[PDB]
Write a protein that binds this ligand. Structure first.
Ligand SMILES: Nc1ncnc2c1ncn2[C@@H]1O[C@H](CSCC[C@H](N)C(=O)O)[C@@H](O)[C@H]1O
Length: 241
């Protein structure tokens, strides 16, 4: 099941596998939603949250965007596989105005379609010598057909209000994995995350955790020890109460 956008660490192929272990719930909360491969593909209501506000705002905007609108912008900027100057023009325009629609368009032309925002909130991905294709409109339509059940938020997982009755799915940056968004992670964050989880479990709230116990060289240790407290499936693992 497709995510709304390409994303490092997406759960596109693993979703069907994880879903079988999901409990009943009043609301599904995708705490670190990322590219939405999970959010778009589970029964709602869904609360999709991610700390990267620019991306969340982009999703919020797409709610009332048609593929038509996307095309108009692409033509407006005369984007192609070699429009390096127009790409740069579009990038400046987004950095100055922060129009989420522009961010969506930009990503189709950035290197490897990856979104990179620095501390000031500017897009830094270099021109990717590419433009939209077929798979492009597919992910979009999939977004549009499944965004009704979703409410978006852009908060640190700590500030997210957890309600009785919801299932909290968490797929945070892997403390031992290579990825852009790891810049928000730290052993500190993980410690707080696991403590929140122990807390949810105490309220009777179900959660599910995706992560890597030991990928190449390095290994996650506090997790392996902490995971013993719960059930772990080996696919990378899935830890749930
Ligand atoms: N403190 C924090 N609070 C909330 N989200 C955070 C965070 N630090 C990092 N994140 C987010 O956690 C995400 C983990 S990657 C999740 C990918 C998602 N499962 C998918 O299929 O696309 C990153 O995209 C990042 O935006």
């Amino acid at each position: 099941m497709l995510g709304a956008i390409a994303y490092t660490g997406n759960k596109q192929s693993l979703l069907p596998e994880l879903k079988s272990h999901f409990p009943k719930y009043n609301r599904f909360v995708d705490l670190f939603c990322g590219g939405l491969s999970v959010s778009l593909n589970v029964n709602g209501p869904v609360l999709a949250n991610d700390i990267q506000e620019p991306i969340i705002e982009m999703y919020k905007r797409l709610i009332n965007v048609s593929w038509d609108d996307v095309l108009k912008v692409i033509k407006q900027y005369k984007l192609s596989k070699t429009s390096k100057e127009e790409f740069l023009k579009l990038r400046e325009d987004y950095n100055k105005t922060r129009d989420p629609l522009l961010l969506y368009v930009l990503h189709f032309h950035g290197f490897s379609n990856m979104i990179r925002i620095n501390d000031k909130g500017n897009f830094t991905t270099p021109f990717g010598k590419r433009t939209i294709n077929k798979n492009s409109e597919k992910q979009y339509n999939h977004f549009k057909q499944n965004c009704d059940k979703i409410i978006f938020s852009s908060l640190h997982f700590k500030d997210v209000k957890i309600l009785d009755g919801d299932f909290v799915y968490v797929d945070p940056p892997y403390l031992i994995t290579v990825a852009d968004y790891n810049k928000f992670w730290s052993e500190d964050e993980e410690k707080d995350l696991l403590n929140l989880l122990d807390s949810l479990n105490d309220r009777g709230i179900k959660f599910g955790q995706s992560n890597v116990l030991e990928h190449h060289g390095k290994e996650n240790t506090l997790l392996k020890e902490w995971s013993k407290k719960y059930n772990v499936k080996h696919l990378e693992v899935y830890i749930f109460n």
